Design a protein around this ligand. Structure first.
Ligand SMILES: Nc1ncnc2c1ncn2[C@@H]1O[C@H](COP(=O)(O)OP(=O)(O)OP(=O)(O)O)[C@@H](O)[C@H]1O
Ligand SMILES: [Mg+2]
Lengths: 395, 831
């Protein structure tokens, strides 16, 4: 308390100094999206505003007399108008092709720069930019499942030389199926963490759109943008949202969504080659998927995430109780035996509730009794709500 | 008006009336009750006697009672009430006075809040008291012999240090330190050593050293000794201990710091004690580690480049660094061991110099086996390959000190070799091979090289660099004379060469962290010409205060950066910016406070001033891939100024050196695409990619170890060599002198946690690894890690990640769980 008077004196000076520093440097606005002045190149910005003219986005439609020395380009300037224009002298004639977006000036509308194909902002947000914090070490009891998963979705991209030499075309599709909580999305999160190519996460419910043909459009632009990369990974979580089997119920039942599935089937294996895309779909209702989608060449590998065996359950217990403050002789093999048919999700909850009982008793170490009570609360007491019995019939 | 409050208001008159009577019979019962009346409200911290606050003007009636007659019992309790009234007002020379002159009973009887104000007073008046007032501290001392025991009783220990630090009497703390608070008292004042200046800098450590020595806490006593660079005290700490199990742990800590101790053969277990501290077993321990991490597979630069996902002499020379950096100190490579001739000869000119030397970096710390591999290139007819293989031996022996010396033998015969390139691979080889040795054998063999007529300025610089590494922080008299001699013997035009910038570093390296021992040296730098003198004056002054955080010195550094010149005259401005990082790298508070100042140099600065601030970011946060610096560097990778673009990208690699950061590698891969058509920028991008995957993530270049509290002389020498060479990135790094990038070999250490048994064998146990948490202040048992996870022991610790044993099966010899740790069975465990 002896320094209380002086601490506030220097604390206020620092705040006064901080505010005074902001007076000279400038830390304000931030509501019109203004960057801090340390990045302000005003001299350059003035030059850009004159030297660099703005360009209107237009799409080339037809090239007239491309063979001759006077090639004329018909452009569609969005909602403005259509113009027959000539190419600018600072770009090559071979760089502009029909059906490609171009940048045109406002005076003579001559094409100044080719532009990337238009992609829906929602589709652009589908590619994973921050990888998950989950590795393959966090998946237990899926040893055979992971190796099959890796050798199709990881090995070809990491070491492509081992397949070209032997004339091997590795599978370009994996379907992960199993009851809920079995690790289907967990393995895909491990794949995205480890992968070096572009990863696109697509939830099937995201492909359901209000208007007619819009869902199939997003599938087209999804594969269009995946093809703009040397190697790509598309993850279709809960593909049963759009991958349902086709049917005719008199009325137009699920006709629109079936078209989205038909588009996805077309991009996977159609007239055109798919590309270097290796797709990956996870669903807990694989019996509902269309036979065309469940066919090799679209989903070549069918990896089943069945409920873990005794060795697998003990491994998942070790994974989730790794960072716990457990006791000496926690018989994890015994705990794995007390939940015969239990998903890894239940095992994680058992670990959480086991330490939750210890927190309840103001104890810093989780005993074996706490795990025994956790098994009763999760495996036994919560067996009324268990999704396992209903979903093994589906898988 | 409460009746009980009015009852005390009655004592303002009726009790004073009892003290107003001539007879002393009524004096004692009223005063004794009045003395106890204070304790009535003292029992509650918030409750204070407000009627007593109205008795302050009543002291006039009591003025003659406590002043004008005998002090037996009349003044005794009369003054103490005024002292109780004295914490309410300013209390300048009053609260202590009635305490000092009044009753001399136990201090805590008047309240914890009273002594806290009383303790605050004794420090305030201590500064006021002059030398002639030494007779006035007789009762002043008695209180602090009772205030300190009172403070430790009620867990208010940190206030106890605050008392005797102010009065500069920290010595008497150790006599009253108990077993229940020795760690808390040490942990507090040791955290104050990062800000308190000399002479209280060493003095505060000495008292902490005494406490640890008193309580037989040898491993943490040795840590304090190294921080004070007390060569004498290191021997006394080492040999005082009798538990031999405890002693081998120090040699691990001592060897990691790179300080050698010449033990006597009479000391028990002499052999393994030297072997442990000489890091001869480091290669086996390192190789056994990564075998457990199953990363023995060699890595090609293509696996680092990942060009298959991408939608020349420089390229080949760039990939040579990327090759060696990734599998450094691993001993196996798919690109150099396997028919190295095609790859090595695929490089050209000085590219073969670094390509050949890259073979010694993959055998780092492999003194025996590494020497077995460079010999094939040691007989090469090409001038560069042999000299590159010459420097490869120095890289191989860098960081390892064996008893009988190979590296001097293979390279002594070539320090005067007629071809400068053959010479060039020699001195830089010896500098790395014996960095931080202060061995007169190598120095005397290396010293005349700088004075040779055949030695060019390129050779002249490396000799100062190398001799600086051997005698780093030693203030060697011999090297100072010759480095100064060379500096003024060079011409005005000769000093214009940027290789001349290295001679001051050799002088600066010798005084690394020494402090104010440079005024004699700085006086010598007065006689040399400009603008080299200004650069030399700035550089050596900076290395003097490295890891000190002396703001006054940083104040001078910012003034040098303040005045701008419309290049040639502003070459010294880059060193000042690197100086701020080199000074503030001590404590976290200064380092982060330096980041904002770096941004302002990055905004208001001129090109030559702005070209070095990326280097400052690398030095201040090497192997610490924090997002604030990376984003700051990321924005400035594609800058208009080529050096700033070159330096920033290299800084990103050094900031993430050995971290294997997935986010950083993605940025570097993206920077490769952006700078594909700029070979110079791409070479820096390629250089950064090699550094971020240094040693497959098993190595660090951070100069700090022991919970970021111990400064390694060799590591800073290795870093300073690289970043000071980066001030002229056009001519040195991108030019013909990229071998200077092998200076960071001196800074290579493994981010290690290997717990050994008492017989030094591996002992994998469960540990908790997570971000460190400051444990200063809050009493009880606060957690020192947050967001932690449980791994087995042979795990790589990132910067700022502490480690605690999850269980209690083993008692660590040292609290600091870094590097190699010896574990002992806990007797209480399994009782
Ligand atoms: N094999 C496993 N090893 C370790 N933890 C697992 C495993 N399987 C599941 N878990 C845990 O259980 C959680 C269940 O989530 P997860 O995404 O894996 O479910 P899912 O199989 O995709 O389920 P749903 O079919 O309902 O989408 C995971 O987040 C993880 O913490
Ligand atoms: Mg899922």
């Amino acid at each position: 308390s002896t320094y209380s008077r002086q601490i506030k004196q220097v604390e206020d000076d620092i705040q006064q100094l901080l505010k005074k520093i902001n007076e000279l440097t400038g830390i304000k606005e931030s509501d019109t999206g203004l960057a801090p002045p340390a990045l302000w190149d005003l001299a350059a910005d003035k030059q850009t505003l004159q030297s660099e003219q703005p360009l209107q986005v237009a799409r080339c439609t037809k090239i007239i007399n491309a063979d001759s020395e006077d090639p004329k380009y018909i452009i569609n300037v969005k909602q403005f108008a259509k113009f027959v224009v000539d190419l600018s002298d600072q770009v090559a004639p071979t760089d502009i092709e029909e059906g490609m977006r171009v940048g045109v000036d406002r005076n003579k509308y001559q094409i100044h720069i080719p532009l990337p194909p238009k992609i829906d902002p929602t589709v652009t947000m589908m590619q994973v930019e921050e990888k998950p914090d989950v590795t393959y070490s966090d998946v237990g009891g899926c040893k055979e499942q992971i190796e099959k998963l890796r050798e199709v979705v990881e090995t070809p991209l990491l070491h492509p030389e081992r397949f070209v030499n032997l004339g091997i075309e590795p599978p370009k599709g994996v379907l992960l199926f199993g009851p809920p909580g079995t690790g289907k999305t967990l393995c895909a999160r491990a794949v995205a963490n480890r992968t070096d190519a572009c990863f696109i996460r697509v939830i099937g419910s995201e492909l359901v759109q209000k208007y007619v043909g819009e869902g199939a459009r997003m599938v087209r632009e999804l594969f269009e943008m995946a093809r703009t990369k040397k190697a790509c990974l598309i993850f279709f979580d809960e593909i049963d949202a759009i991958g349902g089997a086709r049917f005719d119920d008199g009325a137009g039942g699920d006709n629109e969504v079936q078209r989205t599935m038909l588009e996805l089937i077309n991009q996977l294996d159609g007239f055109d080659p798919r590309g270097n895309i290796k797709v990956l779909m996870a669903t807990n209702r694989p019996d509902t998927l269309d036979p065309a989608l469940m066919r090799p060449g679209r989903l070549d590998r069918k990896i089943e995430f069945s409920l873990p065996d005794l060795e697998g359950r003990t491994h998942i217990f070790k994974i989730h109780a790794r960072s716990m403050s457990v006791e000496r002789d926690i018989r994890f093999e015994l705990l794995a035996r007390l939940c015969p048919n239990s998903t890894g999700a239940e095992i994680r909850s058992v670990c959480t509730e086991a330490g939750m009982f210890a927190i309840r008793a103001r104890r810093k170490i989780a005993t074996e009794k706490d795990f025994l009570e956790a098994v009763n609360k999760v495996i036994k007491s919560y067996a009324k709500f268990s999704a396992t019995p209903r979903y093994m019939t589906y898988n | 008006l409460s009746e009980e409050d009015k009852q005390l208001q009655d004592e303002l008159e009726m009790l004073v009336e009892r003290l107003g009577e001539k007879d002393t019979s009524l004096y004692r019962p009223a005063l004794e009750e009045l003395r106890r009346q204070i304790r009535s409200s003292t029992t509650s911290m918030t409750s204070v006697p407000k009627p007593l606050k109205f008795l302050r003007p009543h002291y006039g009636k009591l003025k003659e009672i406590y002043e004008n007659m005998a002090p037996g019992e009349n003044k005794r309790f009369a003054a103490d009430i005024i002292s109780v009234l004295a914490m309410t007002m300013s209390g300048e020379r009053e609260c202590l006075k009635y305490r000092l002159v009044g009753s001399q009973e136990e201090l805590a009887s008047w309240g914890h809040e009273y002594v806290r104000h009383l303790a605050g007073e004794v420090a305030k008046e201590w500064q006021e008291l002059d030398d002639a007032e030494k007779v006035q501290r007789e009762p002043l001392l008695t209180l602090v012999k009772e205030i300190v025991p009172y403070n430790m009783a009620h867990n208010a220990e940190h206030e106890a240090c605050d008392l005797l630090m102010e009065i500069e009497q920290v010595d008497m703390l150790e006599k009253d330190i108990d077993e229940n608070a020795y760690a808390k008292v040490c942990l507090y004042l040791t955290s104050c050593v990062n800000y308190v200046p000399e002479p209280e800098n060493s003095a505060l450590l000495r008292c902490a050293l005494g406490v640890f020595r008193k309580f037989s806490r040898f491993p943490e006593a040795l840590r304090l000794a190294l921080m004070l660079n007390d060569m004498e005290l290191v021997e006394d700490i080492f040999t005082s201990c009798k538990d031999v199990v405890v002693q081998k742990q120090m040699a691990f800590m001592l060897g990691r710091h790179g300080v050698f101790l010449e033990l006597s053969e009479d000391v028990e277990e002499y052999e393994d004690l030297t072997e442990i501290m000489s890091n001869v077993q480091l290669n086996s321990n390192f190789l056994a580690l990564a075998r457990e991490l199953d990363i023995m597979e060699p890595k090609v630069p293509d696996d680092i480049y990942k060009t298959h996902l991408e939608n020349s002499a420089r390229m080949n020379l760039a990939s040579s660094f990327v090759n060696g950096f990734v599998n450094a100190a691993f001993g196996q490579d798919k690109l150099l061991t396997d028919d190295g001739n095609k790859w090595l000869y695929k490089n050209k000119d000085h590219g073969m110099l670094s390509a050949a030397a890259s073979l010694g970096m993959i055998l780092l710390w492999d003194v025996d086996g590494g020497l077995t591999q460079i010999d094939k290139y040691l007989y090469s007819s090409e001038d560069y390959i042999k000299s590159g293989a010459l420097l490869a031996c120095g890289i191989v022996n860098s960081g390892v000190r064996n008893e009988c010396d190979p590296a001097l033998a293979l390279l002594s015969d070539y320090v005067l070799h007629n071809s400068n390139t053959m010479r060039l691979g020699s001195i830089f080889g010896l500098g790395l091979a014996y960095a931080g040795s202060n061995r007169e054998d190598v120095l005397t063999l290396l010293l005349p090289v700088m004075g040779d007529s055949k030695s060019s300025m390129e050779v002249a610089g490396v000799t100062a660099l190398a001799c600086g590494m051997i005698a780093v922080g030693s203030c060697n008299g011999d090297v100072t004379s010759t480095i100064l001699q060379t500096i003024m013997e060079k011409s005005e035009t000769e000093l214009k060469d940027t290789y001349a910038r290295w001679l001051p570093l050799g002088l600066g390296l010798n005084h690394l962290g020494k402090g104010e021992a440079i005024e004699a040296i700085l006086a010598a730098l007065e006689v040399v010409s400009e603008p080299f003198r200004s650069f030399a004056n700035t550089l050596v002054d900076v290395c003097a205060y490295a890891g000190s955080g002396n703001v006054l010195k940083v104040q001078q550094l910012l003034h040098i950066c303040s005045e701008h010149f419309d290049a040639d005259m502003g070459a010294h401005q880059g060193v000042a910016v690197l100086g701020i990082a080199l000074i503030a790298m001590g404590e976290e508070i200064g380092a982060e406070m330096a980041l904002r100042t770096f941004g302002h140099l990055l905004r208001y600065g001129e090109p030559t001033l702005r070209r070095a601030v990326p280097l400052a970011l690398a030095l201040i946060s090497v192997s610490n891939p924090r997002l604030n610096i990376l984003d700051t560097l990321s924005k400035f990778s594609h800058d208009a100024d080529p050096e700033v673009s070159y330096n920033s990208i290299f800084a990103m690699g050094m900031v993430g050196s050995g971290t294997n950061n997935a986010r950083l590698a993605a940025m570097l891969r993206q920077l490769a695409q952006y700078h594909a058509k700029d070979p110079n920028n791409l070479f820096m991008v390629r250089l950064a990619q090699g550094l971020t995957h240094l040693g497959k993530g098993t190595l660090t270049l951070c100069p700090y170890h022991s919970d970021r509290q111990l400064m390694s002389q060799v590591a800073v020498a290795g870093l300073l060599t690289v970043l000071v060479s980066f001030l002229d990135v056009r001519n040195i790094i991108l030019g013909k002198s990229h071998y200077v990038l092998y200076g960071l070999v001196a800074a290579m250490q493994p981010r290690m946690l290997v717990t050994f048994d008492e017989e030094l064998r591996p002992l994998p146990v469960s540990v908790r690894v997570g971000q460190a948490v400051d444990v200063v202040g809050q009493a009880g048992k606060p957690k020192t890690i947050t967001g932690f996870q449980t791994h087995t022991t042979p795990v790589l610790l990132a910067h700022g990640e502490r480690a605690e044993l999850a269980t209690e099966e083993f008692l660590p010899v040292t609290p600091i769980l870094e590097g190699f740790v010896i574990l002992r069975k806990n007797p209480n465990y399994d009782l």
